Design an enzyme around this catalytic site. Sequence first.
Site, PDB file in Angstrom:
ATOM      1  N   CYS A   1       1.131  -1.610  -0.046  1.00  0.00           N
ATOM      2  CA  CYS A   1       0.095  -0.065   0.274  1.00  0.00           C
ATOM      3  C   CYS A   1       0.440   1.276  -0.121  1.00  0.00           C
ATOM      4  O   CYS A   1       1.227   1.590   0.994  1.00  0.00           O
ATOM      5  CB  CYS A   1      -0.403   0.021   1.296  1.00  0.00           C
ATOM      6  SG  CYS A   1      -1.742   1.510   1.639  1.00  0.00           S
TER       7      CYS A   1
ATOM      8  N   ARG B   1       0.348   5.115   3.313  1.00  0.00           N
ATOM      9  CA  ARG B   1       0.623   4.502   4.686  1.00  0.00           C
ATOM     10  C   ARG B   1       0.861   5.483   4.963  1.00  0.00           C
ATOM     11  O   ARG B   1       0.810   5.765   6.380  1.00  0.00           O
ATOM     12  CB  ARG B   1       1.414   3.858   4.756  1.00  0.00           C
ATOM     13  CG  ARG B   1       1.140   2.077   4.445  1.00  0.00           C
ATOM     14  CD  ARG B   1       1.485   0.991   4.627  1.00  0.00           C
ATOM     15  NE  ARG B   1       2.542   0.738   3.537  1.00  0.00           N
ATOM     16  CZ  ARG B   1       4.320  -0.022   3.044  1.00  0.00           C
ATOM     17  NH1 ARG B   1       4.661  -0.054   4.961  1.00  0.00           N
ATOM     18  NH2 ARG B   1       4.786  -0.263   2.391  1.00  0.00           N
TER      19      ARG B   1
ATOM     20  N   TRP C   1      -8.931   7.292  -0.371  1.00  0.00           N
ATOM     21  CA  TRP C   1      -9.722   7.902  -1.611  1.00  0.00           C
ATOM     22  C   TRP C   1      -8.571   6.497  -2.476  1.00  0.00           C
ATOM     23  O   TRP C   1      -7.411   6.180  -2.603  1.00  0.00           O
ATOM     24  CB  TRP C   1      -9.575   8.083  -1.419  1.00  0.00           C
ATOM     25  CG  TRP C   1      -7.724   9.471  -0.818  1.00  0.00           C
ATOM     26  CD1 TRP C   1      -7.019   9.472  -1.702  1.00  0.00           C
ATOM     27  CD2 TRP C   1      -8.003   9.730   0.521  1.00  0.00           C
ATOM     28  NE1 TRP C   1      -6.037   9.553  -0.442  1.00  0.00           N
ATOM     29  CE2 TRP C   1      -6.527  10.301   0.722  1.00  0.00           C
ATOM     30  CE3 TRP C   1      -8.711   9.588   1.766  1.00  0.00           C
ATOM     31  CZ2 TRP C   1      -6.140  10.417   1.663  1.00  0.00           C
ATOM     32  CZ3 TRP C   1      -7.752  10.083   3.199  1.00  0.00           C
ATOM     33  CH2 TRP C   1      -6.544  10.346   2.819  1.00  0.00           C
TER      34      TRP C   1
ATOM     35  N   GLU D   1      -4.704   3.608 -10.390  1.00  0.00           N
ATOM     36  CA  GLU D   1      -5.424   2.776 -10.231  1.00  0.00           C
ATOM     37  C   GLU D   1      -6.570   2.467 -11.199  1.00  0.00           C
ATOM     38  O   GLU D   1      -6.776   1.099 -11.826  1.00  0.00           O
ATOM     39  CB  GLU D   1      -5.666   2.679  -8.971  1.00  0.00           C
ATOM     40  CG  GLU D   1      -5.226   2.079  -7.763  1.00  0.00           C
ATOM     41  CD  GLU D   1      -5.546   2.280  -6.388  1.00  0.00           C
ATOM     42  OE1 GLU D   1      -5.651   1.087  -5.942  1.00  0.00           O
ATOM     43  OE2 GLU D   1      -6.044   3.360  -5.914  1.00  0.00           O
TER      44      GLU D   1
HETATM   45  C1  HEM Z   1      -6.376   6.695   1.923  1.00  0.00           C
HETATM   46  C2  HEM Z   1      -5.314   6.659   0.632  1.00  0.00           C
HETATM   47  C3  HEM Z   1      -4.740   5.528  -0.014  1.00  0.00           C
HETATM   48  C4  HEM Z   1      -4.000   5.291  -1.308  1.00  0.00           C
HETATM   49  C5  HEM Z   1      -3.951   6.893  -2.102  1.00  0.00           C
HETATM   50  C6  HEM Z   1      -3.812   3.691  -0.991  1.00  0.00           C
HETATM   51  C7  HEM Z   1      -3.291   3.361  -2.531  1.00  0.00           C
HETATM   52  C8  HEM Z   1      -2.989   1.960  -1.919  1.00  0.00           C
HETATM   53  C9  HEM Z   1      -2.729   1.091  -4.219  1.00  0.00           C
HETATM   54  C10 HEM Z   1      -2.389   2.046  -5.071  1.00  0.00           C
HETATM   55  C11 HEM Z   1      -2.145   0.051  -3.623  1.00  0.00           C
HETATM   56  C12 HEM Z   1      -1.670  -1.094  -4.492  1.00  0.00           C
HETATM   57  C13 HEM Z   1      -3.393  -1.952  -5.562  1.00  0.00           C
HETATM   58  C14 HEM Z   1      -2.992  -2.483  -5.791  1.00  0.00           C
HETATM   59  O1  HEM Z   1      -2.394  -2.108  -7.434  1.00  0.00           O
HETATM   60  O2  HEM Z   1      -3.845  -3.732  -5.966  1.00  0.00           O
HETATM   61  C15 HEM Z   1      -2.690  -0.366  -2.452  1.00  0.00           C
HETATM   62  C16 HEM Z   1      -2.611  -1.672  -2.113  1.00  0.00           C
HETATM   63  C17 HEM Z   1      -3.129  -2.113  -0.279  1.00  0.00           C
HETATM   64  N1  HEM Z   1      -4.166  -0.814   0.756  1.00  0.00           N
HETATM   65 FE1  HEM Z   1      -3.762   0.880   0.630  1.00  0.00          FE
HETATM   66  N2  HEM Z   1      -4.313   3.322  -0.125  1.00  0.00           N
HETATM   67  C18 HEM Z   1      -4.820   3.723   0.585  1.00  0.00           C
HETATM   68  C19 HEM Z   1      -5.891   3.767   2.031  1.00  0.00           C
HETATM   69  C20 HEM Z   1      -5.800   2.316   2.775  1.00  0.00           C
HETATM   70  C21 HEM Z   1      -6.495   2.134   3.471  1.00  0.00           C
HETATM   71  C22 HEM Z   1      -6.867   2.938   4.435  1.00  0.00           C
HETATM   72  C23 HEM Z   1      -5.971   0.358   4.160  1.00  0.00           C
HETATM   73  C24 HEM Z   1      -6.648  -0.972   4.823  1.00  0.00           C
HETATM   74  C25 HEM Z   1      -7.316   0.085   6.250  1.00  0.00           C
HETATM   75  C26 HEM Z   1      -4.989   0.373   3.119  1.00  0.00           C
HETATM   76  C27 HEM Z   1      -4.765  -1.414   2.972  1.00  0.00           C
HETATM   77  C28 HEM Z   1      -3.881  -1.622   1.386  1.00  0.00           C
HETATM   78  C29 HEM Z   1      -3.788  -2.896   1.607  1.00  0.00           C
HETATM   79  C30 HEM Z   1      -3.251  -3.926   2.692  1.00  0.00           C
HETATM   80  C31 HEM Z   1      -3.147  -3.191   0.843  1.00  0.00           C
HETATM   81  C32 HEM Z   1      -2.063  -4.732  -0.277  1.00  0.00           C
HETATM   82  C33 HEM Z   1      -3.549  -5.097  -0.969  1.00  0.00           C
HETATM   83  C34 HEM Z   1      -3.393  -5.582  -2.545  1.00  0.00           C
HETATM   84  O3  HEM Z   1      -3.119  -4.635  -2.904  1.00  0.00           O
HETATM   85  O4  HEM Z   1      -3.326  -7.314  -2.764  1.00  0.00           O
HETATM   86  N3  HEM Z   1      -4.965   1.165   2.474  1.00  0.00           N
HETATM   87  N4  HEM Z   1      -3.228   0.603  -1.741  1.00  0.00           N
HETATM   88  C1  LIG Z   2      -5.839  -4.270 -10.700  1.00  0.00           C
HETATM   89  N1  LIG Z   2      -5.104  -4.174  -8.998  1.00  0.00           N
HETATM   90  C2  LIG Z   2      -5.723  -5.324  -8.402  1.00  0.00           C
HETATM   91  C3  LIG Z   2      -7.244  -4.660  -7.172  1.00  0.00           C
HETATM   92  C4  LIG Z   2      -7.162  -4.206  -6.202  1.00  0.00           C
HETATM   93  C5  LIG Z   2      -7.053  -5.503  -5.139  1.00  0.00           C
HETATM   94  C6  LIG Z   2      -6.999  -5.627  -3.863  1.00  0.00           C
HETATM   95  F1  LIG Z   2      -7.016  -6.715  -3.331  1.00  0.00           F
HETATM   96  C7  LIG Z   2      -6.662  -4.453  -3.755  1.00  0.00           C
HETATM   97  F2  LIG Z   2      -6.172  -4.340  -2.109  1.00  0.00           F
HETATM   98  C8  LIG Z   2      -6.598  -3.579  -4.093  1.00  0.00           C
HETATM   99  O1  LIG Z   2      -6.364  -2.214  -3.612  1.00  0.00           O
HETATM  100  C9  LIG Z   2      -6.303  -1.034  -3.684  1.00  0.00           C
HETATM  101  C10 LIG Z   2      -7.114   0.182  -2.783  1.00  0.00           C
HETATM  102  C11 LIG Z   2      -7.858  -0.244  -2.027  1.00  0.00           C
HETATM  103  C12 LIG Z   2      -7.339   1.120  -0.770  1.00  0.00           C
HETATM  104  C13 LIG Z   2      -8.153   0.708   0.694  1.00  0.00           C
HETATM  105  C14 LIG Z   2      -7.166   2.700  -1.078  1.00  0.00           C
HETATM  106  C15 LIG Z   2      -6.542   2.637  -2.554  1.00  0.00           C
HETATM  107  N2  LIG Z   2      -5.913   3.961  -3.417  1.00  0.00           N
HETATM  108  N3  LIG Z   2      -6.926   0.704  -3.184  1.00  0.00           N
HETATM  109  C16 LIG Z   2      -6.742  -3.834  -5.158  1.00  0.00           C
HETATM  110 CL   LIG Z   3      -9.441  -1.281  -7.643  1.00  0.00          CL
END
Ligand code: HEM
Ligand SMILES: CNCCc1cc(F)c(F)c(OCc2cc(C)cc(N)n2)c1
Ligand SMILES: [Cl-]
Lengths: 402, 401
Positions: free
Chosen positions: A106, A109, A278, A283
């Site tokens: 993420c 953070r 947000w 994305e």
């Molecule tokens: C507030 C604005 C936030 C932004 C801009 C952001 C941004 C991102 C981005 C760009 C990814 C990659 C997603 C992907 O391409 O798969 C990601 C993944 C992730 N986010 Fe954040 N996030 C935010 C808030 C949060 C919050 C509030 C949580 C949990 C309380 C969180 C937990 C996670 C986790 C666990 C992942 C890894 C899951 C995955 O991508 O498979 N995020 N985040």
């Molecule tokens: C093709 N990409 C993979 C799609 C994908 C799979 C997941 F399992 C995620 F967790 C995720 O996270 C999206 C996300 C979550 C939050 C809280 C904020 C933010 N900005 N983006 C995105």
């Molecule tokens: Cl998404």
Amino acid sequence: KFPRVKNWEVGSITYDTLSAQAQQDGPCTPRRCLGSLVFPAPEQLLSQARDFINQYYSSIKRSGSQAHEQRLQEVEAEVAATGTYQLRESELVFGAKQAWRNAPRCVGRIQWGKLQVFDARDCRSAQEMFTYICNHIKYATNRGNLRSAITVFPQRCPGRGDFRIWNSQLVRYAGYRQQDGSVRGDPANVEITELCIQHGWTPGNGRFDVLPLLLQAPDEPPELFLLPPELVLEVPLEHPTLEWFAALGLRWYALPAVSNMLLEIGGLEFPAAPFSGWYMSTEIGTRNLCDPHRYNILEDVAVCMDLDTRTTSSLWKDKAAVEINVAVLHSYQLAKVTIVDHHAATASFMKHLENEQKARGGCPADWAWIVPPISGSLTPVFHQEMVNYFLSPAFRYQPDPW
Amino acid sequence: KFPRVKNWEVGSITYDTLSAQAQQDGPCTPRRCLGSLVFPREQLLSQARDFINQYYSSIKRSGSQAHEQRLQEVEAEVAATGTYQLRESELVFGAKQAWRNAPRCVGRIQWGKLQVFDARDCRSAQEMFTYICNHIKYATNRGNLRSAITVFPQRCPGRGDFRIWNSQLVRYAGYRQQDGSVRGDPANVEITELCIQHGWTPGNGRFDVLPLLLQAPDEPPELFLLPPELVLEVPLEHPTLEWFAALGLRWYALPAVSNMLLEIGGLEFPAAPFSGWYMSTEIGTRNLCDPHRYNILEDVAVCMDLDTRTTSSLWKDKAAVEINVAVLHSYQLAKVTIVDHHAATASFMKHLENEQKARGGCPADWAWIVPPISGSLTPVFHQEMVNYFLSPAFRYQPDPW
Ligand code: HEM
Ligand SMILES: CNCCc1cc(F)c(F)c(OCc2cc(C)cc(N)n2)c1
Ligand SMILES: [Cl-]
Ligand code: HEM
Ligand SMILES: CNCCc1cc(F)c(F)c(OCc2cc(C)cc(N)n2)c1
Ligand SMILES: C[C@H](O)[C@H](O)[C@H]1CNc2nc(N)[nH]c(=O)c2N1
Ligand SMILES: C[C@H](O)[C@H](O)[C@H]1CNc2nc(N)[nH]c(=O)c2N1
Ligand SMILES: [Ca+2]
Ligand SMILES: [Ca+2]
Ligand SMILES: [Cl-]
Ligand SMILES: [Gd]
Ligand SMILES: [Zn+2]
């Protein structure tokens, strides 16, 4: 010695002492690296809970205090008589924040400390689960001004089933497997679309049809729930200077709410704990609209731009991708919906790593997910060496319930 | 045991069975992953044996005739010396293997066609410089680039090493200023002051081609100036933004790395420069737009009339695209071999498919295969990869000071 990490843009060198405290183990061995793979209880429950309790009493600077002493013994005794324990409401709040703070993929953070925790541990049925989700959506969307939030449903406990949200996100667009092998709508949601129909939902035939929710309460089939359309903020995409762009009819939702990971705290496992923040514009603009296997618009936009799609050396893909990202950023700001561009997102992330180095002496980061999917080396996290490991509390992937 | 590897774009699954023969150990543990770090950190008979076995199985002369004799040949040579000499054909094959095994290179589809120049009979630095200029002329080929490598004498005990102090054969100078900053290429600040300390008189342009600092065993290095008709360069201009050519930007044609150690059969060659042809992002994105290199992005953005005071206008993305467009257009104009990242990644995808059928997988370091712009627009973004070290290989090595 600990891993020494270099920043190449600046020339600076840190050591990740934190990675030594890594609990669960990852997929890489000295023989070979697998860091690019997407998906890689009595006394061990105690040593997890013990470690968590210590984490909690360190955060408030009262480690070793009588109350810390007493709560450890309190947890030790509940595990002995019941096999499990319950978190105090404060430990749950701090726990959810820790799980976000630890999520190595993420990039947002910097915000991990400002997180609104909704306690739904007393939820009793799928109907109360929907009520709780709507309140979440309402609170987090806040008519465009997005607020980070998580709702925690009852923990896994032996004897009883799990609460689960079959939907991967709270807001998802339908993906109708078209008869000629293709898809109308979002192709990432074809399987969940098939499940919604099969479970009673009358499908649309648009391309941005919002899916209903499948909510499953313990030891029950999932029940079908429709989101109230005014609860689901959407943004039509138009482009500040390309005026034909609006005629594409492209839309995306305001609220990214991930609904199918497991939140794990002090050994306790919460299979249902949707969280939302947000969006970062890449994305939507790059991944959700241009991935070959997603909406895949990039050729169609380039032809509209009168680019030469015949050779790759015109860089029509790059040009049409940039403009689709411009449109997302501009359409969200026009609608006054919170959004962050990948340059802002990655620059704040560098501030997070500096904070985490003072605070914990490290930060688990997964380079391939922090670096954005366009303009990578233009952002500062490209040049930043990172160490990837698993700390607890954590959000984890879990099998699909069906 | 056999890593499952997925292509998310297609849905295809393969198993990397070649990873099991991972000769060495990389930097990663079950506890923590370091695949994003640039550098980590008698029994010679075993490595020597294993290379010969690769060789003969490779030409289908497996464990039989000349195989069994070559074995006892190298055993005897090491018994008498402490080391041994490669057959020239082996030399060819180990070079192509070491390139084929380099996991950070996206250009390996070309690994079959490589020009190996045997320079093991080389003594003194003036013979070095001669061997180098033939290489440069052969590989430049008036702008039709041909991949090639020259191998200088191997390291042997009790001796000194042949070292090219230069990291590349073509390197623009980087002069520090009393204002603390750099005129030229900052990457080459240290080599430039060595060229001066060891003789060279400094220029003052942003693109002054350095001299060569070539070093013979147990002798200090000597400067050698390259003949400018041998160093083919490309002035950069844009197909439609007329003002771009006035920025005075220019890169060189031949990418030629001159400071990585070659390892073959437990033999180590501390000097063996290799060259191919550029991929446009190397020049247009990394060398010109990286904050610690020429860092020209904001200059182009200003000239482009772009809103550089709010990040969300994506002025950085737009100016970077056009610098790449200028590179691709300026090399084609001058008839110099160049490849763009879309063509180069699609070819690396074929090479994976080849290597899956040929060797059952392929060592690849995702962070370095994926291009540094438009990452997810190339098909290698959506391809899981497995990174590991096979020998023969190219390794980094400490600087000669
Ligand atoms: C507030 C604005 C936030 C932004 C801009 C952001 C941004 C991102 C981005 C760009 C990814 C990659 C997603 C992907 O391409 O798969 C990601 C993944 C992730 N986010 Fe954040 N996030 C935010 C808030 C949060 C919050 C509030 C949580 C949990 C309380 C969180 C937990 C996670 C986790 C666990 C992942 C890894 C899951 C995955 O991508 O498979 N995020 N985040
Ligand atoms: C093709 N990409 C993979 C799609 C994908 C799979 C997941 F399992 C995620 F967790 C995720 O996270 C999206 C996300 C979550 C939050 C809280 C904020 C933010 N900005 N983006 C995105
Ligand atoms: Cl998404
Ligand atoms: C078609 C010709 C070639 C293309 C398009 C190409 C492309 C690339 C690219 C983009 C990189 C990453 C650059 C970087 O790490 O900064 C790279 C790295 C590398 N390539 Fe190739 N290359 C070519 C020829 C060769 C040849 C001829 C050899 C050896 C005989 C070779 C061996 C290597 C090695 C050892 C690296 C290590 C990366 C590093 O040191 O940082 N390549 N190549
Ligand atoms: C700032 N990045 C680091 C720069 C860098 C460092 C190395 F040690 C390399 F080996 C290298 O090789 C790049 C290359 C080599 C060949 C033969 C062809 C080609 N197209 N590219 C590039
Ligand atoms: C195969 C590859 O690792 C995979 O497509 C990953 C790479 N990095 C990523 N990074 C982010 N932020 N999001 C993604 O979906 C991916 N996909
Ligand atoms: C920290 C990070 O691993 C490092 O900057 C790498 C990433 N990918 C790269 N890719 C290429 N082609 N060249 C590089 O120098 C790098 N640098
Ligand atoms: Ca109690
Ligand atoms: Ca001064
Ligand atoms: Cl280079
Ligand atoms: Gd217009
Ligand atoms: Zn790893």
